[PDB]
Amino acid sequence: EIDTLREEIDRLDAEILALVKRRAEVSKAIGKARMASGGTRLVHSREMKVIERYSELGPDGKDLAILLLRLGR
Amino acid sequence: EIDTLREEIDRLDAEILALVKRRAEVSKAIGKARMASGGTRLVHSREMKVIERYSELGPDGKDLAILLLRLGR
After folding, report:
1. d(C-alpha B19, C-alpha A9), whole Å
2. Where is the Chorismate mutase domain (chains A, B)?
3. Is A20 on the interface with B (CB under 8 A)?
4. Chain A neighbors of B21, CB-CB under 8 A
5. What CATH code would you report for B1-73?
């Protein structure tokens, strides 16, 4: 049973890593299109709603959203 | 196009949040079974391999693994 639980963590990490890699590539695409338009970063609106969604995990959820933001350049 | 990219970030965040919530519940299950056996935490072996896997994202990947570990009690 602890074996099968650790195996399930391995699967969840594989999925999370794949999604996070892809979120960074989509974010960098967005940031390139925005910087080619000299557009203003959506820090107070968009990025705050991203943080709010992860905040449901607690304090570590806000820090997680912050890393995801750093990761997306 | 920036609209459709932001929509794809919304989907990736929804998936990541769901997986992270579940990883915390599996981790807490593992930690309960381990503490009921008075077993030694696998800090230097298991948790280091968890950090190594996320390290492929860079430095923010190691911090991400560290949060995932904190999140799983």
Report:
1. 10
2. 1-73
3. yes
4. 57
5. 1.20.59.10
